[PDB]
Amino acid sequence: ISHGRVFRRMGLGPESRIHLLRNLLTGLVRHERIEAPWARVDEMRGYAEKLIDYGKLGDTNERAMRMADFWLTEKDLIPKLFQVLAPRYKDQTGGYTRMLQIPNRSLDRAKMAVIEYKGNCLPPLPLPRRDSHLTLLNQLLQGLRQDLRQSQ
Amino acid sequence: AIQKMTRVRVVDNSALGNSPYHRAPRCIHVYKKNGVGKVGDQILLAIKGQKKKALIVGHCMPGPRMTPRFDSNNVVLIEDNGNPVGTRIKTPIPTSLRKREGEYSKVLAIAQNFV
Amino acid sequence: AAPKNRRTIEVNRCRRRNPQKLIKVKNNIDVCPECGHLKQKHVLCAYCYEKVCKETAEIRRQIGKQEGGPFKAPTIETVVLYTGETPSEQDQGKRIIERDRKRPSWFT
Amino acid sequence: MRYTDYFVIVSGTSTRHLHAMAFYVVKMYKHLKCKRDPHVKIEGKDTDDWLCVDFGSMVIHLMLPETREIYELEKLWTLRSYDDQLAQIAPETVPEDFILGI
Amino acid sequence: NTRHIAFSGNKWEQKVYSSHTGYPGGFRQVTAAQLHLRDPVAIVKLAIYGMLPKNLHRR
Amino acid sequence: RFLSPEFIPRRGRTDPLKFQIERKDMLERRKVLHIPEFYVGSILRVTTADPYASGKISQFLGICIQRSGRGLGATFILRNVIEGQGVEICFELYNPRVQEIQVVKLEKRLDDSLLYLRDALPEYSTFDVNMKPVVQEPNQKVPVNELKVKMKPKPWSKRWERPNFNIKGIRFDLCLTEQQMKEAQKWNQPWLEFDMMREYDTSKIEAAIWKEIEASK
Amino acid sequence: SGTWWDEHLSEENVPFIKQLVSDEDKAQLASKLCPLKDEPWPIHPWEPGSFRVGLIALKLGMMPLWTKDGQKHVVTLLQVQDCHVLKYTSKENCNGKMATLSVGGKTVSRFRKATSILEFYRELGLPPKQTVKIFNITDNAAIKPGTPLYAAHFRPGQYVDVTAKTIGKGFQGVMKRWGFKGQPATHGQTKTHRRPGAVATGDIGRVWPGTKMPGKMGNIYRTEYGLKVWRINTKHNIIYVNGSVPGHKNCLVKVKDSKLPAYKDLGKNLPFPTYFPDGDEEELPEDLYDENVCQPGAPSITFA
RNA sequence: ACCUCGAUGUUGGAUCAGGACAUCCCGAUGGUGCAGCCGCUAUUAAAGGUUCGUUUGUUCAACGAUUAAAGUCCUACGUGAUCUGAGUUCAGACCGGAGUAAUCCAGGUCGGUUUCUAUCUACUUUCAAAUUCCUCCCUGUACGAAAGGACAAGAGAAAUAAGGCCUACUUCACAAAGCGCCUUCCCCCGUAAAUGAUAUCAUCUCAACUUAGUAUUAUACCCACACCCACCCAAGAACAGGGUU
Ligand SMILES: [Mg+2]
Ligand SMILES: [Mg+2]
Ligand SMILES: [Mg+2]
Ligand SMILES: [Mg+2]
Ligand SMILES: [Mg+2]
Ligand SMILES: [Mg+2]
Ligand SMILES: [Mg+2]
Ligand SMILES: [Mg+2]
Ligand SMILES: [Mg+2]
Ligand SMILES: [Mg+2]
Ligand SMILES: [Mg+2]
Ligand SMILES: [Zn+2]
């Protein structure tokens, strides 16, 4: 029995859970794109988004500094968080990270996800693209839309 | 809940209850179908080398909402007849004792404080 | 506990060869419109992804050369540049990374 | 005092005399009782000396003179915290630092 | 006219039909009369069924 | 602004409509009986109808020790030592039985629960049954009592020294030893301060409750 | 290959299709808000032995409710959402003693439903419902399909029966499933703490059928009998029922009149075919209450 | 008696029970040396129920407090591939006794290794149509010299059992739980009566027949069937199930 259990147990306990996630997050901050097991990417993903909001609070916020101190192990990334990442996402209220499913790991046969912060410098991931508006079905649907708008 | 082998406190002016002794009074028996005793229930006591019947008056275990909850297990020594051996009850007793089924009127009569 | 009698080949063959224990056919395969290799739907094309990751691998190598040592992640944004292209006016004031090859078609 | 409007104490000659009174009072009660007025129960029929009956807003105590001398119910209810019987008994306090000495 | 069958003697309410559900205490014993009221077809059905050979062809 | 704890709902999969229904019911009751702004440290005197009697009036005074529950069933618990007996009563806020709630002495304590007062010395929970209300100017900061309380011997109802309770209002120096303190530290869980998905922000939620409340009046 | 509705739609068409189908469910609900006006079936006055249709309600949650005697009764809240009549089957065709009425529940998406089911609902002229339950009715109780149903269908003082699928606890041990005592924790007891005891007697060379042993618990239909209806909110269509109701919150329950012998002929005054708000015979207030219920916004209770 | 059981012994206990009625309690009758209250005896009934401690390894028993009662059995004196090992059993030791001794003892006393990864059979949500105690009313009545003290009909409180649930309390905290809350519905097959023959009266009928007596059943629950991309889930070992407007 475990309905509405939100967090998935991960390491060799709750302390380890955090520690793995913190490592993943540290990587992602630094490199801006990271491949890891699908469960762990999904798990860390949330904390990644929550980090940008704390980063949006600014350098001056003492609370936000203490949070950044804990979650970034490199200590050189903390300036980057506050002077690179926070300014980048000024417009958006949410949705800073994208996650995708990529082929399974060779050794292990594990489900693998790539996670990246949006608007990075890197070459863009091959992304799922919906079919063109000029397709036969889309053209017939556009036909129906024309009918409804031109009726009134 | 006061069950078998529970220490209780005799809140009476009765000599037997207030007498200095090496043992605290112990609950021998509970007069209920299931062993647990709430307030108003009768229980048997081993005090000072004798058995005595007693009425439960307030207890530590939480009860219904607006009903009071005491910090000690308080009992009043009664005869088998129903006559309380003591004359006065210093400690407050819950008012709920009134509407409950049984012989409670006499104990209410000798009590000073209702909470 | 221990088996009381040897299981026959027929009994075993019924166990092993029922549809439950068989490999199920995958019906979610498609052609990658980009490269023409096979990809599963709902999953990124293995070929296309390798291609991206080899490019991004080399970019990260150039990042290391310029940064030159640990704990030196800059406090500006970054941009990557190829042979025969120049930073814009808005590109001014951010980290530049150079390349010795032409810009890929897919990377714009 | 959240008990009753009127408290009543009456004495009796003998045990069987007390039953006579209590049983008449309850019997007459039912006669004049309102429909919705709840039914009442006599207390302590097994008891020798003390009988009690509770009504809606009246409470009655039937006793011998013997039990009146030992309970002093009138004194309790007229003057609450100021009666002689409460004075003799004193609250017991645990010692400071919680050390007993012989 | 399976309802209008006749029994010889006191066989209407001497003769019982026994059946057990798998479950403990599942033994049910009903008289021919009381079974007849449940299902009129039942008596004839049970008689014929018992008369056929006890093989796989029976059913 | 002060919003009553009961109005802010817990994290759940309860549909919003259920809360809207309950809020309307609560607000109707608030019109009838004034609910005062009180905190966990504060002193309250509650007057109720007594069903075990023929509509006689009971008042009880004591110190609040906890405030919990949501919607109509939301409650608080009052403590007091009456003539050498500790008494605790849990009261429903929206019970029709209650006649009047008054704030006799409005103060916060260091911590949000005071259930340790059972284990504290008797006098810290002993409050005069007949005391005069003491009132302060409307636009004043809610005053905090920074009292720490002395304790009984170490067998307690709960192990208060453990950091999960996070009690700031106990004189630990007096009762515990240094080794006991460092023993308690084995249960620290320092990551829990920085767990980001563990937190519950009620900002937008409270805003919408305010919108409902201002509409009601 | 399997195809869902989005496979071949551009970003431009997706919002358009979404809004189009949303419009049509609203239009279909709009059409049927006037049952009596549209050519209905004959309405018969109630006589003894008659059974009427029920409802399909969603369990919102739970609340306290107070009575004048001062007692606290917990109520469960049941919201009637897009409840309609689907199909009528005569006593002949159903092969039952009673005729049957089909009732639909929570409105659901057309895109996730089966072909035939979509066809069925198209013929009706209503959007697809999540649950369907069948009610056993007498001949007089017949209601033309497509007719909506409302919470005021029930009135306070009425007792109801409530059936839903219980909360699913998956594969459970014998101890939590059947409340077996289990074995002591100390004094030896090697690797036996929660095990079922001796299963059966040694004489029998088997295990009796229907023995209690560890297995899948919950997730089955259970009914609660004789729940009093304390209160009706007419605006939101809320039924307030006494005590606990089976299944989780935001689940669909089947609620009908109580079957119990005590309340066998209590349906006299209760709106027989159904309650028709469109009738305008008397406009029902915001709320309906039982006599004993303390009104929210009424003066504080005295026992005087 | 027996070439039938047992090489991880047997007694108890734990857990979980299945069944019989020769019924301990609750139900229905007949008689009574049945005024009423308790009682005594017999017929019918196995749906349900049948307590907790102390002494002793206790099965027994005694003792204490209860109850409505604390039934009698059978099931390899049920059940140890589900569990203990307390007594009695192997290697050590002592008291007492036998014996020249080695050693022994139906006595007393201390210590002493309980394996198994389930192949097959069987089974793993069938239905609860719920039982009982107490208090009050009748009534303090009938009855009875008094003392005492009813039955049907009805009301309220509890306790357990089954099935659920989380608004409060509580362990806790997107939830799960009890110490908490909600619901819980048919009757018994023994006799008591008429009318009326054999046997013109009478007679309750293994006579024809007529009422207690339905001398058999409920009602309720479930009940449509795409894609089986992917995601989510109050659904879940996997699988399946629900939602995805
Ligand atoms: Mg692991
Ligand atoms: Mg404790
Ligand atoms: Mg246990
Ligand atoms: Mg072992
Ligand atoms: Mg163990
Ligand atoms: Mg021979
Ligand atoms: Mg042999
Ligand atoms: Mg018999
Ligand atoms: Mg035998
Ligand atoms: Mg065995
Ligand atoms: Mg040893
Ligand atoms: Zn490709």
Swiss-Prot record, chain A:
One of its GO terms (cellular component) is mitochondrial large ribosomal subunit. One of its GO terms (biological process) is mitochondrial translation. SUPFAM superfamilies: Prokaryotic ribosomal protein L17. The keyword Isomerase does not apply. Keywords: Mitochondrion, Ribonucleoprotein, Ribosomal protein, Transit peptide. Gene3D superfamilies: Ribosomal protein L17 (3.90.1030.10). The keyword Ribonucleoprotein applies. Detected in adrenal gland, mammary gland and adipose tissue. It comes from the Eukaryota. It is found in: Mitochondrion. GO terms for molecular function: protein domain specific binding; structural constituent of ribosome. Belongs to the bacterial ribosomal protein bL17 family. Component of the mitochondrial large ribosomal subunit (mt-LSU). Mature mammalian 55S mitochondrial ribosomes consist of a small (28S) and a large (39S) subunit. The 28S small subunit contains a 12S ribosomal RNA (12S mt-rRNA) and 30 different proteins. The 39S large subunit contains a 16S rRNA (16S mt-rRNA), a copy of mitochondrial valine transfer RNA (mt-tRNA(Val)), which plays an integral structural role, and 52 different proteins. This is Large ribosomal subunit protein bL17m. It comes from Homo sapiens.
From Swiss-Prot, chain D:
It is found in: Mitochondrion matrix. It comes from the Eukaryota. Coiled coil: none annotated. Belongs to the Iojap/RsfS family. Required for normal mitochondrial ribosome function and mitochondrial translation. May play a role in ribosome biogenesis by preventing premature association of the 28S and 39S ribosomal subunits. Interacts with mitochondrial ribosomal protein uL14m (MRPL14), probably blocking formation of intersubunit bridge B8, preventing association of the 28S and 39S ribosomal subunits. Addition to isolated mitochondrial ribosomal subunits partially inhibits translation, probably by interfering with the association of the 28S and 39S ribosomal subunits and the formation of functional ribosomes. Associates with the mitochondrial ribosome large subunit (39S) via interaction with MRPL12 and/or MRPL14. The interaction generates steric hindrance that is expected to prevent premature association of the 28S and 39S ribosomal subunits. Interacts with intermediates of the mitochondrial ribosome large subunit (mt-LSU) (recruits the mitochondrial ribosome and complex I assembly factor AltMIEF1 and NDUFAB1); regulates mitochondrial ribosomes assembly. Interacts with MRPL12 and MRPL14. This is Mitochondrial assembly of ribosomal large subunit protein 1. It comes from Homo sapiens. The gene is MALSU1. The chain holds residues 118 to 219 of 234 of the full protein.
Curated annotation (Swiss-Prot), chain E:
One of its GO terms (biological process) is translation. Keywords: Acetylation, Mitochondrion, Ribonucleoprotein, Ribosomal protein. The keyword Acetylation applies. It comes from the Eukaryota. It is found in: Mitochondrion. GO terms for molecular function: mRNA binding; RNA binding; structural constituent of ribosome. Component of the mitochondrial large ribosomal subunit (mt-LSU). Mature mammalian 55S mitochondrial ribosomes consist of a small (28S) and a large (39S) subunit. The 28S small subunit contains a 12S ribosomal RNA (12S mt-rRNA) and 30 different proteins. The 39S large subunit contains a 16S rRNA (16S mt-rRNA), a copy of mitochondrial valine transfer RNA (mt-tRNA(Val)), which plays an integral structural role, and 52 different proteins. Interacts with OXA1L. This is Large ribosomal subunit protein uL13m. It comes from Homo sapiens (Human). The lineage of its organism: Eukaryota, Metazoa, Chordata, Craniata, Vertebrata.
From Swiss-Prot, chain F:
The keyword Mitochondrion applies. One of its GO terms (cellular component) is mitochondrial inner membrane. The modification Phosphoserine is found at residue 4. It is found in: Mitochondrion. One of its GO terms (biological process) is mitochondrial translation. Belongs to the bacterial ribosomal protein bL19 family. Component of the mitochondrial large ribosomal subunit (mt-LSU). Mature mammalian 55S mitochondrial ribosomes consist of a small (28S) and a large (39S) subunit. The 28S small subunit contains a 12S ribosomal RNA (12S mt-rRNA) and 30 different proteins. The 39S large subunit contains a 16S rRNA (16S mt-rRNA), a copy of mitochondrial valine transfer RNA (mt-tRNA(Val)), which plays an integral structural role, and 52 different proteins. This is Large ribosomal subunit protein bL19m. The gene is MRPL19.
